[PDB]
């Protein structure tokens, strides 16, 4: 268990994940194998909230879960749960959360272009340059929706796009540091 793997896990979990979950990952770090009931006792949190967090953790398979059955002295049926962190699973899961973050930004950028520029207040809906041109009549001499009978301005569309472009640059700066840590891990 080289210290580099532990450093990667600590840095990623502490910088780019939730504090309440990091609290449980601390127990996972402290001991490789822990009872689920012992994890509860260490966590000191309500069963319902813990089970919600555990369902999220099960979905993301951050920590692998196994089921063990043994016979108690009393003989009553007992169900025993074991959760333990796996570095190989964790690295990939984290890496892809990182990766799909970018696909989302690209999709938002493309949607911005997808939206139509023409928009008409009386109509109250977006309009394709196509529809605007057909609505235009050569005899009248001006291009204007046939239905609403008011001029169309495209300036309103420009504003939100500019705002989003600024946000993307900030995201790149905030995500810069973690890539070096990832590189140290691949080392």
């Amino acid at each position: 268990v080289p210290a580099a793997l532990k450093r990667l896990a600590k840095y990623v979990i502490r910088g780019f994940y939730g504090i309440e979950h990091a609290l449980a990952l601390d127990i996972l770090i402290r001991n490789s194998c822990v009872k689920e009931e012992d994890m509860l006792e260490l966590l000191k949190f309500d069963r319902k909230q813990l089970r919600s967090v555990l369902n999220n953790l099960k979905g993301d398979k951050f920590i692998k879960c196994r089921m063990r059955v043994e016979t108690a002295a009393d003989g009553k049926t007992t169900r025993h749960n074991y959760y333990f962190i796996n570095y190989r699973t964790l690295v990939n899961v984290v890496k892809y959360k990182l990766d799909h973050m970018r696909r989302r930004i690209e999709t938002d950028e493309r949607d911005s272009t997808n939206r139509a520029s023409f928009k008409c207040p009386v109509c109250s809906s977006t309009f394709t340059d196509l529809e605007a041109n057909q609505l235009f009549d050569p005899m009248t001499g001006t291009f204007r929706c046939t239905f609403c009978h008011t001029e169309v301005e495209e300036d309103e569309s420009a504003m939100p796009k500019k705002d989003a472009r600024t946000l993307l640059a900030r995201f790149n700066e905030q995500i810069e540091p973690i890539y070096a840590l990832l590189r140290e891990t691949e080392d």
């Binding site: 260490l42 000191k44 979905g59 993301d60 398979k61 990939n92 990766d99």
Partner: protein, 171 residues
């Protein structure tokens, strides 16, 4: 029943003494005289002394005379901070704010003096749990970033599809 509520009354009297502020430990017989426990049998008192007084964590024994432990409860905000740090190091967990309040006068002012170093979490019973902050590592998370995080779900992603995505992206 017999010989249980009397012990409870003694322990409550000790809390009343501590609201009084008399740090000096007191004799059990004198406590009985103050609490009108003379009527009770002596043997029950002896059993209490031998077993229950030692079992009670709040109670302490000094020079053959029994009284609370002035060390157990918090007395100064600096010691509260140090205790929180030690609890974080040893994985003890936070301490109940009601107990800290009855322990320390003006505990709320103590917390205000802590400020950022102390993290308080609400509880359905209104009890406040306190956790020391980590000085070594400090990180900032922005709400938009947390949202961009939140949407994406690996649970949708199937494990084989995971290793496949890495292999596809040529690394």
């Amino acid at each position: 029943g017999y010989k249980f509520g009397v012990l409870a009354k003694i322990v409550n009297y000790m809390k009343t003494r501590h609201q009084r502020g008399d740090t000096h430990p007191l004799t059990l017989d004198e406590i009985l005289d103050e609490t009108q426990h003379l009527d009770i049998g002596l043997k029950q008192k002896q059993w209490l002394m031998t077993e229950a007084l030692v079992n009670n964590p709040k109670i302490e024994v000094i020079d053959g005379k029994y009284a609370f432990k002035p060390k157990y409860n918090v007395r100064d905000k600096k010691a509260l901070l140090r205790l929180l740090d030690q609890h974080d190091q040893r994985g003890l967990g936070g301490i109940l704010l009601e107990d800290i309040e009855e322990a320390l006068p003006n505990s709320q002012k103590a917390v205000k003096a802590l400020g950022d170093q102390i993290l308080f979490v609400n509880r359905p019973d209104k009890k406040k749990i306190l956790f020391f902050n980590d000085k070594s590592c400090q990180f900032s998370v922005d709400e938009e970033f947390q949202k961009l995080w939140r949407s994406v779900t690996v649970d949708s992603m199937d494990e084989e599809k995971i290793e496949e995505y890495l292999k596809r992206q040529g690394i």
